[PDB]
Design a protein around this ligand. Structure first.
Ligand SMILES: OC[C@]1(O)OC[C@@H](O)[C@H](O)[C@@H]1O
Length: 303
């Protein structure tokens, strides 16, 4: 910044048009300004390793000093990132991981990133389950609206949700509906589940798009406030949807925190400081009442 070496740190999101990654980027720019770095930001328009890897390659060719990336596949991003590693480029994964997400252990094929910075996503799921159980009075039929098997974060949220719900004997967990990150698909799946199950009590959307689509489906079905919704992430729409009763809880991650600590950790590494192999960022649970608490509303995602 002042006497600091000025670095070029790349940030590759999972998806460009996603308020989570947009807000992560905001946090990253704030940290970059603080320690004198420039962010090289580039992403694909879908959460998809086929389109993310060419972006990663374009970024590698810009010879950044470090790479922050949210890999869109735990296995298919390993060898492409390994190329960056072998070219001397240090990296951190944000939000999602490659391998197991256990890094610098000295073994395994996806061991070379320096750190994994993300929410505690299993906990996120357990929190969503407890919130939904509260909303439905601890009985009735529910299901998880999710993206696609194999996405590390949403896999963990579904596991945490199901393990928590197993402790609630009056609750029935119906089959997970996978929407491939498409809110309109999630809405149509809500409609199908509700048509087969007029007694459906609630739904947990395990990421932004799943929650938005599921909520939109409930509204279109005429069941706002009757079918309870717990939505992961906190796009701007949660203000109106909490107010109207369409969703009961939004589980906000802290993407700016993820971005911020990603850039600072890269800077620390580049100046010879050891960094943690894991940093876990928290949640803010937003409801109808506290969404106007200032300390809370500031966690609603940008854009
Ligand atoms: O906002 C949606 C989102 O980006 O979907 C993928 C997840 O890995 C992110 O944590 C976030 O839920």
């Amino acid at each position: 910044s002042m006497e600091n070496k000025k670095f070029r740190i790349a940030l590759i999101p999972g998806l460009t048009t996603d308020a989570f990654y947009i807000t992560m980027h905001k946090g990253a720019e704030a940290a970059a300004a603080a320690i004198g770095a420039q962010i090289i930001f580039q992403g694909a328009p879908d959460f998809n390793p086929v389109t993310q890897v060419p972006v990663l390659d374009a970024v590698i060719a810009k010879k950044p000093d470090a790479i922050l990336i949210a890999p869109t596949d735990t296995t298919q991003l390993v060898q492409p990132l390994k190329k960056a590693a072998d070219a001397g480029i240090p990296m951190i994964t944000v939000d999602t991981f490659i391998g197991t997400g256990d890094y610098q252990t000295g073994a395994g094929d996806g061991d070379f990133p320096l750190s994994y910075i993300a929410s505690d996503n299993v906990l996120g799921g357990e929190i969503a389950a407890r919130s939904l159980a509260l909303a439905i009075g601890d009985k009735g039929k529910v299901y998880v609206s999710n993206v696609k098997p194999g996405v590390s974060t949403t896999d963990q949220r579904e596991q945490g949700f199901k393990s928590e719900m197993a402790k609630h004997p009056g609750i029935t967990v119906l089959e997970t509906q996978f929407n491939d990150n498409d809110a309109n698909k999630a809405a149509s799946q809500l409609q199908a589940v509700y048509a087969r199950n007029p007694d459906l009590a609630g739904v947990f959307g395990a990421n932004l798009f799943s929650g938005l689509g599921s909520a939109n489906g409930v509204q279109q079905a005429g069941q706002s406030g009757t079918i309870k919704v717990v939505a992961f992430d906190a796009p701007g729409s949660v203000v109106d949807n909490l107010k109207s009763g369409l969703i009961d809880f939004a589980i906000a991650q802290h993407p700016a925190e993820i971005g911020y600590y990603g850039v600072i950790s890269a800077y620390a590494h580049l100046t010879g400081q050891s960094i943690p192999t894991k940093i876990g960022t928290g949640f803010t649970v937003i409801n109808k009442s506290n969404v106007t608490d200032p300390a809370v509303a500031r966690f609603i995602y940008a854009e």
